[PDB]
Each structure stands twice: as structure tokens, then as C-alpha cells.
């Protein structure tokens, strides 16, 4: 199928933006330990919002591209609108780029003023720092996309893969609506904030990744459609079942009733399950091949992604999801550690899993690259992957050291924020190091093209 | 055990839990005016919240333990800076003296805030600090 041609820009643009994310992560990582680095010009809070908004946005481009590609194979027909796919690309790229720039080129508050935040306040919330106009831009682009791709599954086959990925996307769009809801009451604010972040990341995205993964197994393997989709259904079932009440894990210390400590810890315990079964899925349907597949780089990506998703979201999430542990660890380098591996492990990795699949057969090259461009990919796989397990280790080491020095002693013996921060330097230095390894590993993954 | 019985577990399994969650969030919202002490949520504090969002403090600090890990928890900062009585006065000073300029220290920008805006910020923080937070953070340091 031809009009899968549209999926390229989205990937390519996504790769660029993700280079951006790293440099800014690298700035922050330096600012930790050289605390005035690039101050006043680029304060920590600006670098962060660039780092974290480039993450969200690039992953979206990945997702979309992914949809634009696999849907038409699944749907058995050409995509509804290539022109809408191309137009949207530019709107959404223009919007991402313009808003990152606002962050850099104007002090946040003046940017508030400038975009008339005054009218309908939505800025200044973690991951929701974009002006109310950029949010709406993001919304419009999303709705057009659902239309373009959703229209493609009304006419045409309905696989379970497409159905499930479609549910995936629609939910992502709808929940993103709560970003326009900014309650005057602080605890009510945080309460609904989590309906975006967590309902995204432990619920509705899981559908998007599962479906993306299920697709790649099907094609990469030959294994029967009926078992993959049966499995695909099992995994989301466990995701939704554990994840919806699970949002309780974010509900311990914010103002909402105590019963959340119980509900949240109980259901949270179950949340690694989808991810484990995701590793089972991975190995077992890429255990029993109807054919050896030219690209063993997709295989790897597919396994790695499930494995990493499980260590990061699965294992690291459990470590600190029970209330009595969370009580001390909440809002700590342990939080940074989990956030990193899990986002990398599930969502970064899956985006590249598909890229490795779609890309060759998109520049019309073939089902894989020349062995030169294959061993590069695998090197880039291993540098980035290893680097991240390193990044999270140093971060955990620093988290645990923070909890010991600041959280556990009583008043008077607990060390101040800024002073325990200084003891942690060595870890942050090593963290920068792993961060450098990563960039190099991205650059390799890139030069595989 | 086939794909159908798998798919329904998903359908109903998630309809049950969505409604259950919507129920509890209904229940939660009716305790909030007691827990967060909305009776004491003044024009001052709602405005303070605005000042907070518009300057992106959460881009560096944590509030009630969510936010950024660069800089201290402000959720309980009242307690650790002369508390109820003199906090407003402190925060007035705190904001005009940034950045401190100790070499190599992490720095806080100068926001050029009005004495009105700072005074709002203070009530917002003072009020934030009295939310029933299930006894979090563990201690004075936050």
C-alpha cells in the first residue's frame, strides 16, 4: 500500500525532536551540579519544560506515524486522506516548534500574558506548560488525525489490532481534554491532572503500545492472527483492570481521603502484570517463527521494549507504589528514576521498534537494510538501552541516599533540601556520564540510515 | 478459552472499573471542602495559585511532593521559615533577593513580582500547607 508514504515525516520529525530532548536533558543534568550553568539566560525550569514537552510531542509524532502506517495494512485499503495527513503534519510541526520557542525566547510569565492566559488559565502545570492556544492546536490536530485514520477503518477490514489502537487514540485525545480543566482548588487540580498523565501512561497508551507491539509480532513472525489478538486483548484487560483504580497511587498525599492509600496500593500491586505478559507475548510469538525475518533488529526492539517496559514501569513502579514506602520516597530522585526508565522502556522503545520495521519498506528499499545499517542499529540499541539502566541506577542510588538523609530522620537530624542535594553530587555526575553515552547511542541509531 | 471470552473480560472488566472510579471520585469531591479547608481558600490564595502557575515554580520545586526535584518542597516551607506569623514578610524578602549569586549553587530567577503578588503567593503557600495531606511530608524538611 502506497499512502503509507505519509508515515515517514512523522517518524523523521519525531527523531529530530528526540535529539532535542536529549541536549536539554543534558543541560539539566549539568545544572544539577553546576547550578548556575546557563543562568539567567536558560533557567532549569525552561530546560525542563523543553525536555519534557519534546518527549510528549515526539512520542505523539511516533504514535501517529505508526497509525498512518499500520492502519492501512490492517484496514486492507488506501488511507482516507493523504492531504489531511500532510497538512496536519505542518500544522502540528509548526505548533510544536513555535511553542518550544516561546519557552526559550520569553520569560514564562510574559508568555502567559502574551498568549492571553488570563482568559482561560491552563499554563504552569507539570507537562501542561504549553499556552492555552498550543493546547487547542494540539486538540484540533488530534481530532483531524482521528478522523483521517478512523475513517480508514470504517471503510475496510476491522482487525482487533486496529480497533484496539483506535480505542487507544480516541482515549488519548479525550483525556487530553482535562488539560483545559484547571480547578481553583489545589487538591482538586492535582486530582484531575493525574487523569491526563497516569490515565495516559498506565491505561490508554498501553493500548496504543500493545496494539503497536501486536502488529509487529504478527508481521515479524507469521504467528496466527487469532492468538496474537486474543493475547492483545488479554494484556489490555489487565491494564485497564489494574490501572483505573490504580490512579490511587497518585492519590496518597494530596488532600483526597485516606481510603486511597488502601485502594491505590492494592490495585497498584497488580499494574506490572500487563507488562510481564507483554514480555511473555514478545518471546513466545517470536519464539515460534513461520519464517526467519531479514531484520532481527525489529525482533530485538520488540523484546527489549517489553523487557525494558517491564523493568522500568513493572519493577521500578512496584518498588515505590505501596503507600508506606511511597510516603518516604514521594517526590524524590527515585521518582525521576522510575519516570525515566518507564517512559524510555515502554514508549521510546516501541516507537523505534516500529520505525525499524516501517522505515526500510517506506523508502522502497526492502524488508530490511544492508548488514552495515543493521549492526549499527543493534549498537545504537545497546548503547541507549544500557545507558538508561545506568541512568536509572545512579538515580535510584541517589534517591535512596536522599530518602535516608532527608526523609527518615526526625526534625533536627534530617538534612536540609539543598544540603542533602550536595551529598548526591557524585551520583548526578555519573548520571551526566550515562547521559553522554546515550546521545552517542542515539547518534549511532540515527547513522544506521 | 478463546479470543471472545478474552475480549469481553476487557469490555465489562473496564466498564465495571470506570463506573467504580467515577463513583469514588464523586465521593472524594464531597469531602474536599473539609479536607482542604475551602472555607479558608480566600481571593488571596486563589490569586496566589495564579502567580504560582504563571511563574512555573513547579518547574523547579515540588508542591505536596509533585513537581520538579531541583529545588525544595514548598508545601511545608511555611513551617521552616518563621511559620504562621512572619512568613509573608520573609517571602517578601525571599523574592526580592533572587538570584543569590553564590557561585555554583543552583539559582532561582528574579520574577519582579508585586508586593501584592508576593502577598498572594504567601497565602496560597500558607493555605497549601494546612491541607489534610494524610500527614505528608515526614518532617520539617519536606
Amino acid at each position: 500500500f502506497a499512502s503509507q508514504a505519509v508515515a515517514k515525516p512523522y517518524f523523521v520529525f519525531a527523531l529530530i525532536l528526540f535529539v532535542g530532548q536529549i541536549l536539554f536533558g543534558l543541560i539539566m543534568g549539568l545544572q544539577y551540579v553546576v547550578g548556575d550553568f546557563l543562568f539567567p539566560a536558560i533557567p532549569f525550569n525552561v530546560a525542563r519544560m523543553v525536555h519534557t514537552n519534546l518527549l510528549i510531542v515526539w512520542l505523539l509524532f511516533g504514535f501517529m506515524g505508526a497509525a498512518y502506517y499500520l492502519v492501512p495494512e490492517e484496514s486492507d485499503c488506501e488511507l482516507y486522506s493523504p492531504k489531511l495527513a500532510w497538512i496536519l503534519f505542518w500544522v502540528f510541526a509548526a505548533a510544536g516548534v513555535l511553542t518550544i520557542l516561546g519557552y526559550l525566547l520569553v520569560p514564562y510569565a510574559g508568555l502567559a500574558r502574551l498568549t492571553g492566559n488570563e482568559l482561560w488559565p491552563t499554563m504552569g502545570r507539570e507537562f501542561l506548560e504549553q499556552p492555552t492556544i498550543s493546547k487547542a492546536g494540539i486538540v484540533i490536530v488530534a481530532l483531524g488525525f482521528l478522523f483521517n485514520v478512523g475513517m480508514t477503518v470504517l471503510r475496510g477490514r476491522k482487525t482487533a489490532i486496529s480497533m484496539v489502537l483506535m480505542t487507544g487514540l480516541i482515549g488519548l485525545a479525550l483525556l487530553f481534554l482535562f488539560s483545559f480543566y484547571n480547578p481553583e482548588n489545589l487538591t482538586r487540580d492535582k486530582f484531575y491532572w493525574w487523569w491526563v498523565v497516569h490515565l495516559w501512561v498506565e491505561g490508554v497508551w498501553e493500548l496504543i503500545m500493545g496494539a503497536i507491539l501486536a502488529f509487529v509480532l504478527v508481521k515479524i513472525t507469521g504467528v496466527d492472527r487469532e492468538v496474537i489478538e486474543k493475547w492483545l486483548y488479554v494484556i489490555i484487560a489487565m491494564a485497564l483492570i489494574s490501572g483505573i483504580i490504580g490512579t490511587g497511587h497518585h492519590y496518597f498525599w494530596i488532600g483526597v481521603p485516606g481510603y486511597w492509600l488502601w485502594l491505590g496500593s492494592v490495585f497498584s500491586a497488580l499494574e506490572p502484570l500487563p507488562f510481564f505478559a507483554m514480555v511473555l507475548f514478545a518471546f513466545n510469538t517470536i519464539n515460534r517463527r513461520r519464517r526467519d525475518y531479514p531484520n532481527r533488529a525489529v525482533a530485538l526492539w520488540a523484546m527489549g521494549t517489553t523487557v525494558m517496559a517491564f523493568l522500568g514501569a513493572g519493577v521500578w513502579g512496584f518498588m515505590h507504589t505501596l503507600a508506606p514506602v511511597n510516603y518516604y520516597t514521594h517526590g524524590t530522585q527515585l521518582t525521576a528514576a522510575h519516570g525515566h526508565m518507564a517512559f524510555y522502556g515502554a514508549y521510546a522503545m516501541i516507537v523505534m521498534t516500529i520505525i525499524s520495521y516501517a522505515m526500510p519498506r517506506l523508502r522502497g528499499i526492502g524488508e530490511a537494510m544492508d548488514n552495515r545499517s543493521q549492526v549499527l542499529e543493534m549498537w545504537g540499541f545497546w548503547l541507549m538501552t544500557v545507558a538508561m539502566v545506568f541512568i536509572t541506577l545512579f538515580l535510584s542510588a541517589a534517591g535512596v541516599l536522599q530518602v535516608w538523609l532527608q526523609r527518615m530522620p526526625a526534625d533536627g537530624a534530617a538534612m536540609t533540601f539543598m544540603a542533602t542535594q550536595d551529598q548526591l553530587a557524585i551520583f548526578y555526575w555519573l548520571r551526566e556520564g550515562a547521559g553522554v553515552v546515550f546521545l552517542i547511542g542515539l547518534v549511532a541509531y540515527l547513522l544506521s540510515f | 478459552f478463546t479470543k471472545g471470552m478474552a475480549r469481553n473480560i476487557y469490555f465489562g472488566g473496564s466498564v465495571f472499573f470506570i463506573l467504580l472510579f467515577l463513583a469514588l471520585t464523586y465521593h472524594t469531591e464531597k469531602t474536599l471542602p473539609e479536607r482542604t479547608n475551602e472555607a479558608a481558600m480566600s481571593a488571596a490564595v486563589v490569586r496566589g495559585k495564579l502567580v504560582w502557575e504563571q511563574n512555573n515554580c513547579v518547574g523547579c520545586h515540588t508542591l505536596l511532593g509533585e513537581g520538579a526535584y531541583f529545588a525544595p518542597e514548598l508545601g511545608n516551607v511555611v513551617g521552616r521559615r518563621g511559620g504562621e506569623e512572619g512568613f509573608n514578610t520573609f517571602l517578601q524578602a525571599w523574592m526580592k533577593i533572587q538570584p543569590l549569586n553564590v557561585p555554583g549553587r543552583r539559582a532561582m530567577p528574579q520574577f519582579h513580582l508585586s508586593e501584592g503578588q508576593v502577598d498572594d503567593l504567601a497565602e496560597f503557600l500558607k493555605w497549601s500547607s494546612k491541607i489534610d495531606t494524610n500527614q505528608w511530608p515526614p518532617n520539617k524538611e519536606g
Partner: antibody, heavy 124, light 108 residues
Framework: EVQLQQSGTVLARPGASVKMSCKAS????????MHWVKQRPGQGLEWIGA????????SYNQKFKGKAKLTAVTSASTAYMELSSLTNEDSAVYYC?????????????????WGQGTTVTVSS | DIQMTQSPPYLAASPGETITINCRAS??????LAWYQEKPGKTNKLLIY???TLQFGIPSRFSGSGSGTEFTLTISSLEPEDFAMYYC?????????FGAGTKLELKR
């Protein structure tokens, strides 16, 4: 309230040794440099040195590298200074004080609270 | 080592008047000068650090200014309790060093 409480007057003979203390209360002892300052009558303040009770490191003014030894005991929130081989030039008031900012890398900052001073008189 | 000399050694003034005192450094210390007040039977008290930043709690009647090498503290409308000894402290370099002080006496 941040307070430093210093020990009473000590009297020594020349060549002898003396150990005075500074008891910190009202803040996180382990998070600030504790500094020590010397003052003799009509004679201007001199920075002796500092200890950081969070990791026990010290820093001495090169002029007091023989004279003085700073240590700290974290469970009692107290810091100590031992002066040695007392000379008549060591009769003076000695202050402890607390760096006005917390952390290990603010080594050379100004102070925000002082002890009241402990007198040392050296005489035969 | 960098050496501080304050001037004048002593100064007489009356309540309600303005006085201003000087602190010079042997070499550049950028902005990092602090001032303390000493009174009999009280602990030394930080007034200004970083050349011009008022410490928490100190009334604004006090102020200071300078960089590099030459610094001043000013009191705006002297008050009865302002008659005290004032010391300056450089906080740019190890070792910390102090001026020998200025005595601000009450005229009669």
C-alpha cells in the same frame, strides 16, 4: 530559634592545651558549615577555620594550621575547637557561628548567628 | 589573603541623622561583602551580605553598596540602638577576612 551556646571561660598555662564547645539548637546541625573566629582586645576579627558536620570535613586558616583542631559530634549537635601549645597571644575571645546558607559547597560565606564567645586566658 | 580596612576608626553622630561608612579591600572581591553589628551583651548580627542585600529582619534604614574594591554601609536615620561597633567581612575567597571595625558613638 537558631542559637549557638558556647562553653564558659577557660584558664590555661603556656604550652598547655584547651578544648571549648559550641552547642547548636533550632536548626539542622548537619547541614551548615560551623565557623570559628578569634578576637583579641583592640585587635580585629580573624577567621580561624570551619567544620562541616554532614561529612566531618574541615577547613583551616593557614595561620592556625598548627594551633587549632575542629571536630563536631552529630548526635549532640555540638562542635568543638581544641587549641594547642598555648601562647600568650592566644588569650582572646573565640566565637563559633553558622554559615547563613546550608550545604557543603558554600565553604566561604557570611554567617547568620554567632555564639556569645568563650574567653581563653593564658597566664602563669 | 585579602585585607580589609574600614574607615573611619570611630565616628560620632546624633539620632535622626544619616551616617555612612567605608570598607576597602586590598584586591577585588566582586560583590561579596557583609556587615555585622556588635553590641555589649548581644550576639553579633548580620546586617547586609553580598554588598547590598538586607538580611531578613533588618530594618531598611540600613543599606549598602559597592563592588570590586570599595564598599559602604549607610544608616538612614540613626537610632538610639544603632550606636554599636560595625565590622565588614569579605566572602569571596578563602580565607574569610574582616576589617578591624568602625565605632559609631553618640554625640553630646
Amino acid at each position: 530559634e537558631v542559637q549557638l551556646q558556647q562553653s564558659g571561660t577557660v584558664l590555661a598555662r603556656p604550652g598547655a592545651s584547651v578544648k571549648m564547645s559550641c552547642k547548636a539548637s533550632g536548626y539542622s546541625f548537619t547541614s551548615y558549615w560551623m565557623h570559628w573566629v578569634k578576637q583579641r582586645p583592640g585587635q580585629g576579627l580573624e577567621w580561624i577555620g570551619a567544620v562541616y558536620p554532614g561529612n566531618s570535613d574541615t577547613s583551616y586558616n593557614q595561620k592556625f594550621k598548627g594551633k587549632a583542631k575542629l571536630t563536631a559530634v552529630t548526635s549532640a549537635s555540638t562542635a568543638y575547637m581544641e587549641l594547642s601549645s598555648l601562647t600568650n597571644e592566644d588569650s582572646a575571645v573565640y566565637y563559633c557561628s553558622r554559615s547563613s546558607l546550608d550545604g557543603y559547597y558554600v565553604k566561604n560565606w557570611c554567617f547568620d548567628v554567632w555564639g556569645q564567645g568563650t574567653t581563653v586566658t593564658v597566664s602563669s | 589573603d585579602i585585607q580589609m580596612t574600614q574607615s573611619p576608626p570611630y565616628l560620632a553622630a546624633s539620632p535622626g541623622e544619616t551616617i555612612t561608612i567605608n570598607c576597602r579591600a586590598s584586591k577585588s572581591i566582586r560583590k561579596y561583602l557583609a556587615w555585622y553589628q556588635e553590641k555589649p551583651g548581644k550576639t553579633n548580627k548580620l546586617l547586609i551580605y553580598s554588598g547590598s542585600t538586607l538580611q531578613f529582619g533588618i530594618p531598611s534604614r540600613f543599606s549598602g553598596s559597592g563592588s570590586g574594591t570599595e564598599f559602604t554601609l549607610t544608616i538612614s536615620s540613626l537610632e538610639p540602638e544603632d550606636f554599636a561597633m560595625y565590622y565588614c567581612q569579605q566572602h569571596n575567597e578563602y580565607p574569610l577576612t574582616f576589617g578591624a571595625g568602625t565605632k559609631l558613638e553618640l554625640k553630646r
